[PDB]
Amino acid sequence: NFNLEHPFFFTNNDYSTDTSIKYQASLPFNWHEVMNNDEWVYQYPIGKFVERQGWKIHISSEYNSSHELLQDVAKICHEMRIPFKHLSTEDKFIMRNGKLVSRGFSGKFITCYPNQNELESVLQRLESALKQYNGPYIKRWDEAPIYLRYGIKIILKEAYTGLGFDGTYSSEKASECKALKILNEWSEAPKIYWHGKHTFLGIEHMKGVPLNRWVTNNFPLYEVVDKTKDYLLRVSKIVEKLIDLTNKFHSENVYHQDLHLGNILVKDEDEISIIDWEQAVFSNDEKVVHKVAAPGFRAWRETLPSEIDWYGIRQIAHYLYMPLVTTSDLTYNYVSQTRIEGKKLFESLGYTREHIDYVESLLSYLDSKCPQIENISRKKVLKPMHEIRTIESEQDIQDFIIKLLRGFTLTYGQWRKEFQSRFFPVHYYGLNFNQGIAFSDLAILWSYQQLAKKVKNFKFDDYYEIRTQVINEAVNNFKKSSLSGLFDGKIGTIWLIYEFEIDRAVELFTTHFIEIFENSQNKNLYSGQAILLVGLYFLSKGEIDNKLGEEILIRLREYTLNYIENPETFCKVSDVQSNDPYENFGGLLYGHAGVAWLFGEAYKLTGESIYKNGLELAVDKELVAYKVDSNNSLQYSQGHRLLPYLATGSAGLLLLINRNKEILSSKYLKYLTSLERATDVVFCVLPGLFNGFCGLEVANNIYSDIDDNFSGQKKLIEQLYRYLCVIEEGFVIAGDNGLKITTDIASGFAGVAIGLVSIMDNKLTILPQI
Amino acid sequence: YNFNLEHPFFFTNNDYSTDTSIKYQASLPFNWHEVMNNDEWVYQYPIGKFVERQGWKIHISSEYNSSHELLQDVAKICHEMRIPFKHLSTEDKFIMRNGKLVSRGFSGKFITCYPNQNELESVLQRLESALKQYNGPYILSDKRWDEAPIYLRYGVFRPSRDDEKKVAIDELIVEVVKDERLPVFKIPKGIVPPDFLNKWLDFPFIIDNAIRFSNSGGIYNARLKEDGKKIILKEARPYTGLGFDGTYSSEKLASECKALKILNEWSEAPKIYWHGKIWEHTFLGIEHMKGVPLNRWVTNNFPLYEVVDKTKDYLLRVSKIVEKLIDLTNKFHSENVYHQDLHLGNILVKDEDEISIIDWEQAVFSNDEKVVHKVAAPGFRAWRETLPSEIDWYGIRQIAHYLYMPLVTTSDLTYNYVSQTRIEGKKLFESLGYTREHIDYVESLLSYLDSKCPQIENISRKKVLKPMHEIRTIESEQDIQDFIIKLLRGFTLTYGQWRKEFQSRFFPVHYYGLNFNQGIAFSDLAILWSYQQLAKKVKNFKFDDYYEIRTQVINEAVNNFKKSSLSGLFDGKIGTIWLIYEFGEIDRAVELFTTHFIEIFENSQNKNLYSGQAGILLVGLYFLSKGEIDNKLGEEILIRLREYTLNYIENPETFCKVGASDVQSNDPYENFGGLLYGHAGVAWLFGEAYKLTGESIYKNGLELAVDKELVAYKVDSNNSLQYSQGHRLLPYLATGSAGLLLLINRNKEILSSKYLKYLTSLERATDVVFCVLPGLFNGFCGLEVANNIYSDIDDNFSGQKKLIEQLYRYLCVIEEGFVIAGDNGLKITTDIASGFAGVAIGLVSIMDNKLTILPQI
Numbered sequence A: 001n002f003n004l005e006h007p008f009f010f011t012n013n014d015y016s017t018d019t020s021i022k023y024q025a026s027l028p029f030n031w032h033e034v035m036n037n038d039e040w041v042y043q044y045p046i047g048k049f050v051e052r053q054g055w056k057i058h059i060s061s062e063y064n065s066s067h068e069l070l071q072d073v074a075k076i077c078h079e080m081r082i083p084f085k086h087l088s089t090e091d092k093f094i095m096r097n098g099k100l101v102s103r104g105f106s107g108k109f110i111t112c113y114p115n116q117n118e119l120e121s122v123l124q125r126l127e128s129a130l131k132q133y134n135g136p137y138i139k140r141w142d143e144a145p146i147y148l149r150y151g152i153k154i155i156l157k158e159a160y161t162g163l164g165f166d167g168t169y170s171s172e173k174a175s176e177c178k179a180l181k182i183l184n185e186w187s188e189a190p191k192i193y194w195h196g197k198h199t200f201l202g203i204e205h206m207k208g209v210p211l212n213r214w215v216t217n218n219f220p221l222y223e224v225v226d227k228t229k230d231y232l233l234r235v236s237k238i239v240e241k242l243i244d245l246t247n248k249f250h251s252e253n254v255y256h257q258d259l260h261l262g263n264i265l266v267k268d269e270d271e272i273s274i275i276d277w278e279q280a281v282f283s284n285d286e287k288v289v290h291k292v293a294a295p296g297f298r299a300w301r302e303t304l305p306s307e308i309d310w311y312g313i314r315q316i317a318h319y320l321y322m323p324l325v326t327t328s329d330l331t332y333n334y335v336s337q338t339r340i341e342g343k344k345l346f347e348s349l350g351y352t353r354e355h356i357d358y359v360e361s362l363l364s365y366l367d368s369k370c371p372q373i374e375n376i377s378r379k380k381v382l383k384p385m386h387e388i389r390t391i392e393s394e395q396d397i398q399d400f401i402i403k404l405l406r407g408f409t410l411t412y413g414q415w416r417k418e419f420q421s422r423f424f425p426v427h428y429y430g431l432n433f434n435q436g437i438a439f440s441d442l443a444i445l446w447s448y449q450q451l452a453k454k455v456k457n458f459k460f461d462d463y464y465e466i467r468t469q470v471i472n473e474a475v476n477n478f479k480k481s482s483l484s485g486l487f488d489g490k491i492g493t494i495w496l497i498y499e500f501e502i503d504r505a506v507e508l509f510t511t512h513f514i515e516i517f518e519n520s521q522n523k524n525l526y527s528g529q530a531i532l533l534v535g536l537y538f539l540s541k542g543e544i545d546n547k548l549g550e551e552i553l554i555r556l557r558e559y560t561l562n563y564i565e566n567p568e569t570f571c572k573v574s575d576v577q578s579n580d581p582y583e584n585f586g587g588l589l590y591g592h593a594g595v596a597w598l599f600g601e602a603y604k605l606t607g608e609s610i611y612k613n614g615l616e617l618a619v620d621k622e623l624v625a626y627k628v629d630s631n632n633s634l635q636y637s638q639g640h641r642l643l644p645y646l647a648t649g650s651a652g653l654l655l656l657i658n659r660n661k662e663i664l665s666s667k668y669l670k671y672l673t674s675l676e677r678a679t680d681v682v683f684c685v686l687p688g689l690f691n692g693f694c695g696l697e698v699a700n701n702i703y704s705d706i707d708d709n710f711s712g713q714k715k716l717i718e719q720l721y722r723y724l725c726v727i728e729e730g731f732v733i734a735g736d737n738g739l740k741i742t743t744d745i746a747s748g749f750a751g752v753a754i755g756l757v758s759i760m761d762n763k764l765t766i767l768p769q770i
Numbered sequence B: 001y002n003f004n005l006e007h008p009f010f011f012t013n014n015d016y017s018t019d020t021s022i023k024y025q026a027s028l029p030f031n032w033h034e035v036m037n038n039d040e041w042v043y044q045y046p047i048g049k050f051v052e053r054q055g056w057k058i059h060i061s062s063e064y065n066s067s068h069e070l071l072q073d074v075a076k077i078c079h080e081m082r083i084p085f086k087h088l089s090t091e092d093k094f095i096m097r098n099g100k101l102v103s104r105g106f107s108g109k110f111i112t113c114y115p116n117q118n119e120l121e122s123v124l125q126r127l128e129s130a131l132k133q134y135n136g137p138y139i140l141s142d143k144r145w146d147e148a149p150i151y152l153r154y155g156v157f158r159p160s161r162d163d164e165k166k167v168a169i170d171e172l173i174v175e176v177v178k179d180e181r182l183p184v185f186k187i188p189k190g191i192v193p194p195d196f197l198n199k200w201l202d203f204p205f206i207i208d209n210a211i212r213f214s215n216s217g218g219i220y221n222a223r224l225k226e227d228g229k230k231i232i233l234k235e236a237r238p239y240t241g242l243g244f245d246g247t248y249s250s251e252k253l254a255s256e257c258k259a260l261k262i263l264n265e266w267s268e269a270p271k272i273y274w275h276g277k278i279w280e281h282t283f284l285g286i287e288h289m290k291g292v293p294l295n296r297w298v299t300n301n302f303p304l305y306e307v308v309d310k311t312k313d314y315l316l317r318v319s320k321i322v323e324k325l326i327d328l329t330n331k332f333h334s335e336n337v338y339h340q341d342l343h344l345g346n347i348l349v350k351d352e353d354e355i356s357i358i359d360w361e362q363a364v365f366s367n368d369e370k371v372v373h374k375v376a377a378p379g380f381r382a383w384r385e386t387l388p389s390e391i392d393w394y395g396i397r398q399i400a401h402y403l404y405m406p407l408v409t410t411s412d413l414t415y416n417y418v419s420q421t422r423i424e425g426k427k428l429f430e431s432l433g434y435t436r437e438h439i440d441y442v443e444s445l446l447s448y449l450d451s452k453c454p455q456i457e458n459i460s461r462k463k464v465l466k467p468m469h470e471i472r473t474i475e476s477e478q479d480i481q482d483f484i485i486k487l488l489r490g491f492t493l494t495y496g497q498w499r500k501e502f503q504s505r506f507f508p509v510h511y512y513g514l515n516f517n518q519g520i521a522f523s524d525l526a527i528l529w530s531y532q533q534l535a536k537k538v539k540n541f542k543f544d545d546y547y548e549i550r551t552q553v554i555n556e557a558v559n560n561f562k563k564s565s566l567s568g569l570f571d572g573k574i575g576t577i578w579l580i581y582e583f584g585e586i587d588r589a590v591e592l593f594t595t596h597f598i599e600i601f602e603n604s605q606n607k608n609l610y611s612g613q614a615g616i617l618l619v620g621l622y623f624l625s626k627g628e629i630d631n632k633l634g635e636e637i638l639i640r641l642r643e644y645t646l647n648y649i650e651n652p653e654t655f656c657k658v659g660a661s662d663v664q665s666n667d668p669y670e671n672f673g674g675l676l677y678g679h680a681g682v683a684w685l686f687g688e689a690y691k692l693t694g695e696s697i698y699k700n701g702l703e704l705a706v707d708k709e710l711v712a713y714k715v716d717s718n719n720s721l722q723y724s725q726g727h728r729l730l731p732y733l734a735t736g737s738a739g740l741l742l743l744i745n746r747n748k749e750i751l752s753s754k755y756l757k758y759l760t761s762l763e764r765a766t767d768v769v770f771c772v773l774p775g776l777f778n779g780f781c782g783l784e785v786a787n788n789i790y791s792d793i794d795d796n797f798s799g800q801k802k803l804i805e806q807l808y809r810y811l812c813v814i815e816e817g818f819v820i821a822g823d824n825g826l827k828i829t830t831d832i833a834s835g836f837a838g839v840a841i842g843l844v845s846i847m848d849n850k851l852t853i854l855p856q857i
């Protein structure tokens, strides 16, 4: 679960390809170099009695004086004077030192391992080359960088720490204090209240909130908020304050170089306050590439410092129209599409035409300072969208899905050329779980063949040989890993192969079901034992061996009874604010809210009414966990994260409530239309099935009979157009936390694929029945 | 088929390669794309526009001094209307293709555009009128269009189309049209007349000899008219010829013209005759010298035998030439000229031992700088940015050390390689019998010369290859016991240094067999067989990791086993079965043998022991001699070997080629003849069959095999039998003479007394004091495994002593262990073809008396 990215695609930490300066050192007679740990090179003589542990000596230096210190230490230590190891990469030197890194290992550039009882002159000789150099502190021994071993009522700060890829220390970046002292006239900028040297310069804290919660409090997400319109008048007030103060402080030789979600702060009556003037450089003759900034805001390819801030001051006012800003690091000039997709939404709300046209003309004459920059790279293959249509007929939907299926083949094509480990592009969380109906290719292929089956007379190409050269390593790696479960576990592959090869899945299931089922302990649907769905699905049509079938049937009966006496125990029916799957709780993906499907299938099979009793017990244990929202409906309770979604929140609750009509009573149907009002929003900030808009639109209309749901296609496509970055004759959808492209079940090609095939075929084709 | 690629340590395949030059990037509007198809070009075409194949294309070239301006000056022309284009990616491929090491059929290819056939004049008039001040090379197999660089040709636009009939990707889509990519233009099967192009479409030297024609031309023999006499010509087209620096061909002929005009009173340096410029070419009239080079001078003068020196005085003949070289250094250094690249294709010695340095195509004229010796020879390549005067003196030093002993081919890999050679040279030159004054004078002049080239200490990561300064003599078995564990621990170090980075294979191999993976060849499993046969050979080993890697090599050498399709004993899917049998395991793959032995047998053509069915029959008779296969296939092997012998007896021409031929090479698939790669290994089957069955026809087949193999053996000046192809002699094991001595000496009682009299001549022929290669197929270790493998009496100690001493002459040292250098030594290879496993099985069979590489009875 770590992030390391190159342009265009996404990958893991294996793809580095470091190109820097090799360190290089000499070597005496009967000595050696070795790259043992692949991050340190170790020097050692041949014949010497090496002990274990003892003492270690650490020496740290600055960036510029590394190689001459290395030469002096080498000429001291090579002549029968102790083995030696050091850092092996100039590129990794700025991650070992510099800015905020891991607290356990920081510094420690030069290391030696003395032979216990010979230190009477080595430490004395190490002040010869030292005592005039420098370095970070990381315990002190003398007046030299020689060490021994066996953050942020005035808010303050702290000062060789903070080095980037260029030479700019955090103490150096002087710039902040000169920018504060030349801008002490205005109360929007903070004041300086401490001078001198670990230096402790302080600032005044202006009141306010960050603009993201201002967007969630002022930019509408439900239709009942912000009565009598007039929100665009406030938006005009903030952007007129930005243009006024921008023209006031760009008079005399000062620039900010970053105007992201930070450094802006609105208190009351639309009063901004720019804080933390830290990245202040100024020139107007040479051109500088924008080096360091927040994600979503990055200037391009060696322009003037007057127009570095141009893109930032355009975009900071641009996403106030409709906030989708984080995907501009991949698609240059992305923000044109947000304007035209916010204008139609604002007209659909019913705002005044004067306010909308004034805001559009205001952004137009801010764009009147318009220096495009024809950047020259390989990122420019993914050009923006400049065409917006309207869906009325079914052939438009067929054209959209045959366009979208091409982008899947195109994002498959470029992945195989430079990478060989997996078969398909990934998300950053589940980039190694290469099995099951989860973040894995085996769940991608059957969505592909389904949507090839649905549309029209598709080209057969060569996907037969592709499917067999996928299923060969699938049956190879059925068992060479750990864990168990349905989604990313063990026997989801059996269900997918049977839903794909019939006989092999049946005989692996009947030879491994009792062996794998007793190994797992939990009962949740992700990686537990509810497996019972696969067993009941194989039992209802009938392919299981008989006597083991009744044995596992009375087994699941007695675990159902045992669950009837005990509390929830295995899961919680969790005040953590995370998107993380293992930390997720209280949903259909994670919790006891999904066992209602398992109880309902057993009730639906012949006659078992103890599973009905399990249904009332499960819903009575599950209904307490949800808090109420403003619009009189149930909502997920933890933090300020009021997200009604398929997982955790309201949409999964509406899915589980309307699962079976026959089990319902008048006590159950007390929150039907209020919960439907909960899942009726004008904006979803991230797309997808598990954590996005597509799961909401699936849960809004799945089991309300009929098939003619063209309002559903209209709403889904006309709200899904805002998330797409176009390629040649196709689309590739950026996933959740979107900076790169993603193809998985949650946020990718397969999410939209499963969503559309579930809306067309109203059975929601995950966790099956019959 | 060769696939050579530079890499520090081990030389590998074309996979470790990253372009680190300034890349070329263009801009695209909407409805355009940037497909990167096949790693050379980047494809660009408007989206939705059907490109019409099978028309006319334009090749555009450029110079290195201004090429970006061609990109940003022709980009709006392709942006206007509809023109696809594809251009080269980085500057490194532009250097590699607009240079000197690339073929003339593919040179000058930078921009390729794709017009339609109906728009050619309209695009050509627009692009021609804006490129007046651009210029570049000619590009072969095209024709001149106007004055701007524009060259047309007939070529392939796209691959095969969507849903109609295609036959190829290169020919006419009308009869077959073969590709004729030669530096001429071809109009195939008449012409459909291009009305845009029909109007536009319509020396005091005599040629003597072309020694080369290279890429930029080069040295060209001819005859002058107004002066007569003999002359040579150097030619150089403008804007071609390019190193890894801004430097062209015409920037060096002017430099050597200056360097040969500044000095004129030296009779052994050539005099300029006519430095004229025909058209834009730079021709050059240079006189010719008589004589032979030093590279072939040591072939017939260095004592290879111990009688060939013709009554002493060889070292004085060395010393006069050496003092002639050391005299002619500061004579032209007074003019402050400097001549780089002092390799041994420039010092030519004529009659009465007079020298003449003839190649001057690198010449600086100032000395305060440190440059990389960028263009050099194999062996004389210098050591990272010293001043050019000591670069020249370093070249002089290694000239003198090749004159001392003729191995300097690996001095690029190990710094101060001259140390080991200078240590062994006194023992080489004192073991033959010479006066001490000559050796004293040679070492005195060398000890004068060695201090004018200053030593350096940086080495740059190849530090673990140190020269050897700790030599010993062999007079006890404990020396052999120490050497075997040292070599084995060095092989462990080799596996440790190979396991770090690469994983496509398991062991380092020579670059000939860089793709093969099985058998007693360039492989993996035979190396562990040698490892096991040497590890328990003394008493034991530590065995830190041998068990799990043995399990690994068997369960991914046996699991696939059929991915490649090739037959033979050496590398051909049945030697794999033999190594599984002889590793110490159970017979195991006998089921696979009975499954597909007839299938492997029935679909092969060659019958040599390298990759033919003769080794398959040897494996079969070995398994029948072990005593358990089946009741039926044992009869099938005999009923096939019967009439396999008879097709050879009635017609020996099909199974092998007799004669000497005209081939000077080292590739394993070319050199016919000899014990392994030819005819002399056929009689090994007849010997094994006679030792199993005992009947006369096998003996007669062996006698005819020995009779018809000895045709291609030319007698030396001394009484010695030598294998000879071309102008070279081959007294080696594989394609040589020591292979026949095994066949004669092993079957001594079977053979009659008529063929037993050749042993006294082949013992003289396989007795040299010097070799150039440290190997056993084609090297040294095979020449003294034939000496003591089957005598009668156990006298292993003296032969072992000689082998270990001359291997100390050839080895290289890492840590406490040891490595060895393979064929074409610039690297470290560990296999059974001039590697660690070969010297391992040599040290096995030198006292075990078996020669375990070939399966006996």
Ligand SMILES: Nc1nc2c(ncn2[C@@H]2O[C@H](COP(=O)(O)OP(=O)(O)OP(=O)(O)O)[C@@H](O)[C@H]2O)c(=O)[nH]1
Pocket: B211, B212, B219, B232, B288, B289, B341, B345, B346, B358, B359, B360, B361, B362, B375
């Ligand atoms: N000057 C001269 N050259 C000859 C003679 N005979 C052959 N040559 C040619 O000189 C060439 C020397 O080429 P190399 O030794 O490869 O060196 P080079 O290719 O000239 O490159 P540089 O050594 O950098 O000039 C040979 O390839 C021969 O073709 C001769 O008598 N005199």
